[PDB]
Amino acid sequence: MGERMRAIIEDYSKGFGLGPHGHSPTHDTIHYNTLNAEGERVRDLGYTDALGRLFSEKLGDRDVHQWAVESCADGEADVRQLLLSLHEWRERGRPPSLLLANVLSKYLEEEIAAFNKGIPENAPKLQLETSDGTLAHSGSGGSRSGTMWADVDPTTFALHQASQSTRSTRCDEPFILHLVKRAKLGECVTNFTD
């Protein structure tokens, strides 16, 4: 039962196509991910925007929805739209729609001007400009948001930024009780299946 299981799993999970070294994962003499060399390379880099944390810093504590009713006067833009796009940008890390980019630009302008204030001449700046049609941030040079990546698959990004405790848990419980439990029991309370 076990061997059949393993066979199926190894077959469905096998990679294909060509990797960064130009060869398949099954190539005879030349290899990929030696001793989890890529795993560590992701460990120490992390997937995040600079724009992401500038925003999450300025906004700070206060209500996402509140801010989204603020940033729109009655006539600016549909709240549903920029709410959608914000959600898809923060978790499930994506390139921000030019809607969200315009809003953010006229919101964060002082923090971006402050992050851009000391930079030497030949070094990468941080700029939100949609002058070119496409949003894929492999297109801008990664200089549009603060992203170091061309693409990160949504699920993994979400696990990463949620592994950051700054990501806000719902806590429908009594607050102090919630925090006390988190301190005393730790996260090792789920070590137990009972």
Binding site: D63, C171, P174, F175, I176, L177
Partner: peptide, 11 residues
């Protein structure tokens, strides 16, 4: 103490 046990925390 009732409050400390019952309070939600954002405002």
């Amino acid at each position: 103490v009732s409050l400390i046990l019952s309070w939600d925390g954002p405002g």
